Design a protein around this ligand. Structure first.
Ligand code: MYR
Ligand code: MYR
Lengths: 37, 206, 202, 39
């Protein structure tokens, strides 16, 4: 198993959370995409 | 049970889990997500242009791969992951079958805001079984980025915050014939947290 | 590299009970486990295995003598939604072969159940890997484990086990060569433990 | 997986237990001391 990790994966992981474009809920996706089975 | 299947490769099983060893003879396994082998639901189509901005788009990105084809090898999986969990091993297992004997490469790209942050590359060899060829990725370790991401999501006080964070998180898995570069399967993964684990599978179309 | 002839090495062997609490939660208990050698005179165990044509003595005399092993297990019976009793094993060989694994469950030296599985090779680092994954335990074995656990004392379980053996024979299907022949003897653990022995002619 | 079961497997299983429910052994054979003591 070869793993390629970007040099800033640590700060990039926190950048996903720091924030909390068209939202997925408003895109042309089937109704099933937002209702779990 | 042919759902995530092109004309050359069928993914029979895919699961990501946390296994805890209580003692040398006792193990507890929790599944975060699981696709496996009743009644096959019809796979609804999704216009792939609706997801291009959530995956890498440089040379060799999702659009270039889709345009190269074959179009029947592209899928979008929406998962509702089960994060209700407590000597630990975080792993991914998957199984594929093909009528052909090939050397396959499975590349998994973990993406943040549509950009690759981690790539895992695994090479798999065929085993003949019952007239076909079987390929198995057994207990492949989850990378540290994914393990720390699961931990950080679980520390959020509400599930809607986890879903908000997950809006910019995606995974792109590309399985290719190593000797021909043919795309055997290309699966885009999108996530929400389950309010057990559930999924819907879609065919990606132009 | 303990259970290994010149053509096949059994890397792993485990028998287990896996319970599904719900679709996302599984608990697995190992009854016995070999994972990653004193000699025993094989004539001391002939009466505990079938001895008709193709029996243990015939197989040993045909050879090769380096393919014969005796495993003594101390099984862990300390267990318990939907249950699955299974056996998993993994083998390695420098050769690409079709192998047949025959497992004979024996009572008083007589075969009561035989399981036959055919396995093909997967190339791995210049050598070949063979895997029997989650092979189902037969009903005889499942009911035997249940009856054993219901005995009020471990010495009674050991007494019952005196007349219970398992014979596993792994063969190259094309040449009929015996790649591994493993005789299994059991006691109940007072975790699970084992000792592996080489079977020799004297 | 091909399974060959003897026609009397149920009563055969009960016969293993009959010897203990209604009351040369290995311990007396030429086996190493390690055969009777778990590691
Ligand atoms: C909702 C976030 C929980 C994560 C669910 C697991 C998703 C499948 C894992 C596939 C990632 C394999 C790549 C890797 O770990 O290196
Ligand atoms: C003390 C006896 C129970 C210990 C656990 C059983 C280990 C035997 C595994 C091999 C039996 C598989 C053959 C079969 O049932 O078809």
């Amino acid at each position: 198993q070869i793993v390629h990790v970007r040099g800033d994966s640590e700060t990039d992981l926190e950048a996903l959370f720091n924030a909390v474009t068209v939202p997925m809920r408003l895109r042309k996706l089937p109704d099933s995409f937002f209702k779990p089975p | 049970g042919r759902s995530v299947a092109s004309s050359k490769l069928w993914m029979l099983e895919f699961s990501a889990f946390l296994e805890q060893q209580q003692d040398p003879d006792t193990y507890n396994k929790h599944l975060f997500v699981h696709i496996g082998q009743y009644s096959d639901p019809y796979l609804e189509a999704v216009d792939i242009r609706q997801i291009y901005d959530k995956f890498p788009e440089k040379k060799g990105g999702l659009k270039d791969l889709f345009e190269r084809g074959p179009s029947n090898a592209f899928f979008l999986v929406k998962f509702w992951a089960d994060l209700n969990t407590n000597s630990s091993f975080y792993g991914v297992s998957s199984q594929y079958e093909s009528p052909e004997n090939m050397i396959i490469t499975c590349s998994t790209k973990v993406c943040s805001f549509g950009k690759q942050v981690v790539e895992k590359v695994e090479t798999e060899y065929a085993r003949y079984e019952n007239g076909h060829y079987s390929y198995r990725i057994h207990r492949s370790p989850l990378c540290e980025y994914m393990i720390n991401f699961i931990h950080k999501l679980k520390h959020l006080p509400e599930k809607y915050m986890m879903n908000s964070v997950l809006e910019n998180f995606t995974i792109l898995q590309v399985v290719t014939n190593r000797d021909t570069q043919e795309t055997l399967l290309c699966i885009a993964y999108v996530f929400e947290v389950s309010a057990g684990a559930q999924h819907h599978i879609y065919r990606l179309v132009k």
